[PDB]
Amino acid sequence: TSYIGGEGHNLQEHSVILIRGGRVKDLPGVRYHTVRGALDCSGVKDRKQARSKYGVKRPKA
Amino acid sequence: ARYLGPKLKLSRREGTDLFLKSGVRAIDTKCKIEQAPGQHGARKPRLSDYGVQLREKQKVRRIYGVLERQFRNYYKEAARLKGNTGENLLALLEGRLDNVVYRMGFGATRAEARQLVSHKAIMVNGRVVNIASYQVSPNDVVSIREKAKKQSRVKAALELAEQREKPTWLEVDAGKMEGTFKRKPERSDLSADINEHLIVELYSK
Amino acid sequence: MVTIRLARHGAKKRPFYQVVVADSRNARNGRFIERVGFFNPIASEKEEGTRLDLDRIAHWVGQGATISDRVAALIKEVNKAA
Amino acid sequence: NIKSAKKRAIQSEKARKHNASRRSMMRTFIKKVYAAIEAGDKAAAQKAFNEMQPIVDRQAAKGLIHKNKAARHKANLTAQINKLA
Amino acid sequence: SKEKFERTKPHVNVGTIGHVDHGKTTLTAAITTVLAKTYGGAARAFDQIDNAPEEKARGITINTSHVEYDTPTRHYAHVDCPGHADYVKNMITGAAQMDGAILVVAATDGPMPQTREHILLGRQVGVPYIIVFLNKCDMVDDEELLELVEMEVRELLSQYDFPGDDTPIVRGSALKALEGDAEWEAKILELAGFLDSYIPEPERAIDKPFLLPIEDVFSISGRGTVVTGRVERGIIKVGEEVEIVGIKETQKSTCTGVEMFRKLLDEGRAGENVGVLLRGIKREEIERGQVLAKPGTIKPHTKFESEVYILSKDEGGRHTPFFKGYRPQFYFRTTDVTGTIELPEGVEMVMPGDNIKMVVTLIHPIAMDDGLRFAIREGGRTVGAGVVAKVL
RNA sequence: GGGUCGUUAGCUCAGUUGGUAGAGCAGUUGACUUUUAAUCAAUUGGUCGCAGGUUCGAAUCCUGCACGACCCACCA
RNA sequence: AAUUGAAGAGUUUGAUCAUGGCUCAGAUUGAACGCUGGCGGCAGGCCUAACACAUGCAAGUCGAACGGUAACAGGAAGAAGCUUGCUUCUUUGCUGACGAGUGGCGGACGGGUGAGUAAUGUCUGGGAAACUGCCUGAUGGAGGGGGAUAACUACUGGAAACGGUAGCUAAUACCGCAUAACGUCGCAAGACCAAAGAGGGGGACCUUCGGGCCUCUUGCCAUCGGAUGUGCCCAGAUGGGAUUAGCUAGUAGGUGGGGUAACGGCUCACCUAGGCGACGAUCCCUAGCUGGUCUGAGAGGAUGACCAGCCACACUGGAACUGAGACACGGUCCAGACUCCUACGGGAGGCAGCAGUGGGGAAUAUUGCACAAUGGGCGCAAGCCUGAUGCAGCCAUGCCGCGUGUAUGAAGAAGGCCUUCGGGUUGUAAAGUACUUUCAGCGGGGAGGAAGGGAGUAAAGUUAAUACCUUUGCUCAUUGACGUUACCCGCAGAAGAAGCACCGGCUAACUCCGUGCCAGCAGCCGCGGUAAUACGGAGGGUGCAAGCGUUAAUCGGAAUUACUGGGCGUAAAGCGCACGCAGGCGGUUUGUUAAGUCAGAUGUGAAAUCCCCGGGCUCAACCUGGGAACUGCAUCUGAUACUGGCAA
Numbered sequence A: 001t002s003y004i005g006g007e008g009h010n011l012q013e014h015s016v017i018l019i020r021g022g023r024v025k026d027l028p029g030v031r032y033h034t035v036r037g038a039l040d041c042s043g044v045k046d047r048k049q050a051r052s053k054y055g056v057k058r059p060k061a
Numbered sequence B: 001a002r003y004l005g006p007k008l009k010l011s012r013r014e015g016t017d018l019f020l021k022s023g024v025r026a027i028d029t030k031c032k033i034e035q036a037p038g039q040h041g042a043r044k045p046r047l048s049d050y051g052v053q054l055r056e057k058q059k060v061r062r063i064y065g066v067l068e069r070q071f072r073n074y075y076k077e078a079a080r081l082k083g084n085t086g087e088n089l090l091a092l093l094e095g096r097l098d099n100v101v102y103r104m105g106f107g108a109t110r111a112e113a114r115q116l117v118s119h120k121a122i123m124v125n126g127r128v129v130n131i132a133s134y135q136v137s138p139n140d141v142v143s144i145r146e147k148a149k150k151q152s153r154v155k156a157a158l159e160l161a162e163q164r165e166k167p168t169w170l171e172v173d174a175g176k177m178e179g180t181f182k183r184k185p186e187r188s189d190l191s192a193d194i195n196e197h198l199i200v201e202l203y204s205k
Numbered sequence C: 001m002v003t004i005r006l007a008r009h010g011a012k013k014r015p016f017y018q019v020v021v022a023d024s025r026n027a028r029n030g031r032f033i034e035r036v037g038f039f040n041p042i043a044s045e046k047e048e049g050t051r052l053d054l055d056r057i058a059h060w061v062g063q064g065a066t067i068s069d070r071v072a073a074l075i076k077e078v079n080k081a082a
Numbered sequence D: 001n002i003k004s005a006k007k008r009a010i011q012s013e014k015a016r017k018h019n020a021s022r023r024s025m026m027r028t029f030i031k032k033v034y035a036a037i038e039a040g041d042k043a044a045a046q047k048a049f050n051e052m053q054p055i056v057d058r059q060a061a062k063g064l065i066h067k068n069k070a071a072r073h074k075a076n077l078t079a080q081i082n083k084l085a
Numbered sequence E: 001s002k003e004k005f006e007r008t009k010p011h012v013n014v015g016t017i018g019h020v021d022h023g024k025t026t027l028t029a030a031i032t033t034v035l036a037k038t039y040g041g042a043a044r045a046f047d048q049i050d051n052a053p054e055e056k057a058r059g060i061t062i063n064t065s066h067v068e069y070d071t072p073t074r075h076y077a078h079v080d081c082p083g084h085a086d087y088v089k090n091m092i093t094g095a096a097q098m099d100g101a102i103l104v105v106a107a108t109d110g111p112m113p114q115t116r117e118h119i120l121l122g123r124q125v126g127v128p129y130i131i132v133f134l135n136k137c138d139m140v141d142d143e144e145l146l147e148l149v150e151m152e153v154r155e156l157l158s159q160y161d162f163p164g165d166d167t168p169i170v171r172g173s174a175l176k177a178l179e180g181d182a183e184w185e186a187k188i189l190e191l192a193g194f195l196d197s198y199i200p201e202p203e204r205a206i207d208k209p210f211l212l213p214i215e216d217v218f219s220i221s222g223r224g225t226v227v228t229g230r231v232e233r234g235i236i237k238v239g240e241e242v243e244i245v246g247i248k249e250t251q252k253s254t255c256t257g258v259e260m261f262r263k264l265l266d267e268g269r270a271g272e273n274v275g276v277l278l279r280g281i282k283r284e285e286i287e288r289g290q291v292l293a294k295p296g297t298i299k300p301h302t303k304f305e306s307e308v309y310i311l312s313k314d315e316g317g318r319h320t321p322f323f324k325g326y327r328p329q330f331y332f333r334t335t336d337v338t339g340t341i342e343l344p345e346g347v348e349m350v351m352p353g354d355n356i357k358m359v360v361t362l363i364h365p366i367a368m369d370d371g372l373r374f375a376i377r378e379g380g381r382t383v384g385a386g387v388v389a390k391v392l
Numbered sequence F: 001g002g003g004u005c006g007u008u009a010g011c012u013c014a015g016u017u018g019g020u021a022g023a024g025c026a027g028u029u030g031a032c033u034u035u036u037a038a039u040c041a042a043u044u045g046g047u048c049g050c051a052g053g054u055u056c057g058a059a060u061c062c063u064g065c066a067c068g069a070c071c072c073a074c075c076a
Numbered sequence G: 001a002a003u004u005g006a007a008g009a010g011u012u013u014g015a016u017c018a019u020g021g022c023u024c025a026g027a028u029u030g031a032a033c034g035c036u037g038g039c040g041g042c043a044g045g046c047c048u049a050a051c052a053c054a055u056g057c058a059a060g061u062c063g064a065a066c067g068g069u070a071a072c073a074g075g076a077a078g079a080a081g082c083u084u085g086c087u088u089c090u091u092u093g094c095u096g097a098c099g100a101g102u103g104g105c106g107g108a109c110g111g112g113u114g115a116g117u118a119a120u121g122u123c124u125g126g127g128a129a130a131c132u133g134c135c136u137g138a139u140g141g142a143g144g145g146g147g148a149u150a151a152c153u154a155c156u157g158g159a160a161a162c163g164g165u166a167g168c169u170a171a172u173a174c175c176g177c178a179u180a181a182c183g184u185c186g187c188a189a190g191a192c193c194a195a196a197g198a199g200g201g202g203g204a205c206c207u208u209c210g211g212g213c214c215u216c217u218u219g220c221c222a223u224c225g226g227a228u229g230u231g232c233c234c235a236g237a238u239g240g241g242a243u244u245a246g247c248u249a250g251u252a253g254g255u256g257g258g259g260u261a262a263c264g265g266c267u268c269a270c271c272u273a274g275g276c277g278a279c280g281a282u283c284c285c286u287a288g289c290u291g292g293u294c295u296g297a298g299a300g301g302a303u304g305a306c307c308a309g310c311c312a313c314a315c316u317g318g319a320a321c322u323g324a325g326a327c328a329c330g331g332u333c334c335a336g337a338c339u340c341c342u343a344c345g346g347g348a349g350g351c352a353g354c355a356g357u358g359g360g361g362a363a364u365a366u367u368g369c370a371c372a373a374u375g376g377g378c379g380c381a382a383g384c385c386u387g388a389u390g391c392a393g394c395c396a397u398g399c400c401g402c403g404u405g406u407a408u409g410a411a412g413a414a415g416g417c418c419u420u421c422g423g424g425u426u427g428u429a430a431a432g433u434a435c436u437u438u439c440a441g442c443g444g445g446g447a448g449g450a451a452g453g454g455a456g457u458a459a460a461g462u463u464a465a466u467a468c469c470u471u472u473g474c475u476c477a478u479u480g481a482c483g484u485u486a487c488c489c490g491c492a493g494a495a496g497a498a499g500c501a502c503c504g505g506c507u508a509a510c511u512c513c514g515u516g517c518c519a520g521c522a523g524c525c526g527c528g529g530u531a532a533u534a535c536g537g538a539g540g541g542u543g544c545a546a547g548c549g550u551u552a553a554u555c556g557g558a559a560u561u562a563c564u565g566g567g568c569g570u571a572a573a574g575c576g577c578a579c580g581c582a583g584g585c586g587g588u589u590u591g592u593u594a595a596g597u598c599a600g601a602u603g604u605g606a607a608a609u610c611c612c613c614g615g616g617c618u619c620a621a622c623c624u625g626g627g628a629a630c631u632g633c634a635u636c637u638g639a640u641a642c643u644g645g646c647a648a
């Protein structure tokens, strides 16, 4: 089981994703994360900082 | 590669001017110097141990405009040499072609000197070099490939360059405007205001 | 059979043929009995660019080391009297 | 497999019918010597060996035998009969 | 793979269309049967075409089959079109790949609504070259019946904008044409005469950059992803790299082999029905609807402006009205993407039988171009005719 | 590419002669308590996935489109 | 000249000092993912499926071994039109040459993978009971005959694959005979064994006018060699587990017979009853090994993708043939599975060769060019084959270099942002302005990698020869995949090339707003319950740079497995105590021995790589010369105090 970073995903029942390492150490038992910007998992909407993580592209306009 | 941004911001950041804004008007003063590196340049730093080690490392690197990954190679290069790595590094941070071009008087600024090297404006010992990071050996002859001779800039550079300190380990023709390099650099003739033992600790960690 | 041939070392577009004595069937950069001199196709005008000890070669010739053409060309190039 | 060396595939088959035949009579002449050794007749094997000695070394140079096994064939068998005769 | 292909004579994409079940498979089988005696490349049997499982399961054409033949003068890359209602959408891909539509309707059947579906789609895609073939004519030896159905054809061609005033009609029977009985094979030869007659040689759009709406892509054994389809405009050759435009976000693809009917085409060109192998691309990404464009020539548009003709009940469509917000699918030369009717200010209702215009809100960002005439269907039925005005 | 079954407040999941859709889990609104648990009632909340159509009337049926888990494929 | 080299911090408590875990700060990589992205040089690029494979190609060459000529092009006996010599053309192996076949050689090389393998392997150094194509040194022979067969023809089974029978015929194919030695058997005497011709040219003599014959090049056969490669053997070293303690019966050795190139239980017959094992046998799991790589002050630890050597395998299991050599990648046979074709009778297929495909997966590329250069194969040569190799393509994957401009510039602007709304800050930053153009982009020139080889010819050898062939120059034409090359010249004009992370502390660098233990952050301690430098945005600032972050794995920090270099009264840890076998340590004196030990030398420690000192690439990366080193191991010669053995 893994944590879902950011403030909103779009995953449900399936929506295949990618898993990277790291435990949150906050909700013990979960030692994995989910990659925003990977497969069916999009990027966190409205991110203007640290968008290297959370798979957010540069604001075009 | 080069910083190419606000090149005087570092002057306020390191307090002592880095000779970046030398150009023509040596009278700097137009930046509210020493008191406003940023929106909160009013605060006073406690500036810890790692701080003073880093601030010096940047001051040295930022004066010559070198980059960390290459500068790291310069440390190990200074370490593989015999003798004190401190002096071994100051040599390598001086033998740079564009810097040698600057030291002769060919250049208003150290960076403008690189613009010459980039634009084939130099011919040393019968060879035109583009390599700014060229390690000029002691006693060589740096000159200008004719297409870029005194083209409004070399004269403009040497004009203020006559008020320069004029290093001892080199000579200049100034008639034909050719650099007559001599012996290698030595601790006394160079800097003597920077601190070399600080950076050796920086790469120790 | 043992042959005296080059070995082609160096890099891309700047070859450095390594004249060496190897077990003929082996690889170009493969095993060899022992190396002897070398050749540089791009050092034509400098201190060197072609080294070779003709003594050890003759020692092997007496054993039957068939010299490859390019290397044989070198013996003539290191001049039998120059 | 497709290769002009399929000739080498069938030549091996061609040469083997020949080679086996050669070894066939050869090994039987050796068996003809042991028959005499199992007979104890000093003359029989001596006749059989004098018969097989020229027929065995003749095979050595032909490449059928490695001449050392042939030498061994000549050796011990004779070493048996001289010890017996 | 085999056989290096030569661009001998000009191609003319033809096919068999009309109301479901009039003999279009036997006919297509018979077309190749004819020239087998004179020309080399022909002679394709009934089972040679009926190879698809479900196409075999009914004995009718559902999967869009393909064959090759030609007259002693010009080439013909035929399209064995399906007639079943669901696959009529799949015959549109072939209709939007066809240069000449041969209206195959039997004299003992008469112009039906499923016939008129294929007809509106034909003109609204770009086909003006049309000859007509009447099948099953051995049944009704009543010539009086023939001249009323012929009347209906020229009226219907005029009804859905086709030159019925210059449309040859062939009252034949393709079954006896496939029986080997030369007489009805001669009836096909009558149309074979018309084959070079009505349709001239069109324009090759080679000058302009490469462009191509995808028809078919398969998991080719030992090669991978091979895209097939007639070139929109422009040419290609083995070793050049073009861009894949379409619903997805545009990127590159290389020509790693160009072929035509299992025959090695040396160099691709506009119009010629080509099968091209693509480097790097996989079966999953690519499909019909997208575009193989010469790099950076198409803006990935989201919406556009156009006018939509509305069929009434008898016209084959709307038996009851609609309005703004309506969701039909606009077919762009090969596609089936929902082009929602978004009528600007005022027009808030449309009855069956109008030519209503509106700026569309397309569901997918497709490769758009101003001036495209497109045929529209909605919910298993055609709703009318369309023509692109502007593109957002 | 085709053909069968699916999508319910913000969420888990209901409602067969087609007659105006349900709680449980969120909160908000006051005391208590440093602030919570415990304790209490009022209460908005689906635009019944999206589009039109059959009927007087559609969560119910007609297909389609987005998107799923299934059966055949096709084989330049 | 050739190691001048080693850092800490945050976290238990009200607080402190300990032990102690824990986590970060560093570096690294076949990396992947995300945001992002201008160019070039040089490297690497399927570690998951040792899963299955369509297509093409990856090993052929010699007419200077032979019978032949089916093709292509000549000569020619002849032929056909008709411009009777312009053409046409049925025949012909007489040539240049050449399909298919005989045969010699190679296919046992190069290339790929790491499944298996815990020792039949490797690394290291020694050893004797070995064989060895091609190359090369020496000594000699190289006589004279015979019988078949392929090809080619006829008939014929068969869908195909693929045969069957009857005739033809050659040789460096094959088989006898002669002759044999320092060769093989045997102590010896004796006994016995081999083969092959062709090619260029040629005066005389001679032509059953094939040629005999001369001369030279090349080849054949045998013996001894060497060189080379390979086989074989000994000892040591070579992961984890004792919750694997006894293992084994060709097993341990002898003898005789046989067998391998060679010794041997390699294999048999019989006798003996042993041999291995706590200094780890057998068994189980994993895993190719080393040189090397990353890291570490060093010792060590981890690891060993690439480059090279060794080992092993080729769809699975096993077997054997040809052959110097395989018990064989693109060889054969059997049996199985997985596929393909079929007339369903029967056959065919092996990408772990280079590309490529489906698939697996987080993920790693073109079905390109040339044999121009090196290497290899065959050949006398010329050449021909070469997915070895040399090159280009695609990927920022890494390493390195360059560029994205310089200078001037105060209304100290606009607006953003904070504000003690005084103003400060952004910010010489920008605009404006004076110059400049690297790299790209477009238009022209132009290195070096190319040595040779061809033909003609001169001269020195050759010899009866001024002929041929060999050696050394001359001459002309030239031979380059890359290649619209590197580099040079010129053109428009700053024009086309900077983002990414972080800012509580650790750890460089801050505020205001929005949200209120909610939403979120995170590597660790821990922040958010209304005023957050820890969330989300904005401005500012810092780090780094064509990269910046994240996860992964390795080592360091870790003296938290401590030989270097730790501990046990209470923090973890003295067996409950004692005797006692093996093992470990051992008073003192003399002598001796020289095993350890130390010195010196020798052989070796493959190269490459790491280090030092130079050089060539515009520099660097890189390539590279010579040195050093490879800390070791075996032998020989010394010292012989110290320890060990021996005597007293």
Ligand SMILES: Nc1nc2c(ncn2[C@@H]2O[C@H](COP(=O)(O)OP(=O)(O)CP(=O)(O)O)[C@@H](O)[C@H]2O)c(=O)[nH]1
Pocket: E019, E020, E021, E022, E023, E024, E025, E026, E027, E059, E060, E061, E062, E081, E082, E083, E084, E135, E136, E137, E138, E139, E172, E173, E174, E175, E176
């Ligand atoms: N009398 C007669 N019968 C015919 C003729 N042609 C075909 N039939 C029969 O008509 C039927 C339809 O054949 P088919 O060729 O599949 O038709 P189609 O027109 O392709 C049908 P789809 O609409 O699915 O594509 C078959 O039964 C065929 O044998 C004809 O010329 N005359």
Ligand SMILES: *C(=O)[C@@H](N)CCCC[NH3+]
Pocket: E066, E077, E215, E216, E228, E229, E230, E259, E260, E261, E262, E273, E274, E275, E276, F076
């Ligand atoms: C394959 O047959 C193509 N190359 C030819 C045109 C038909 C495309 N469906």
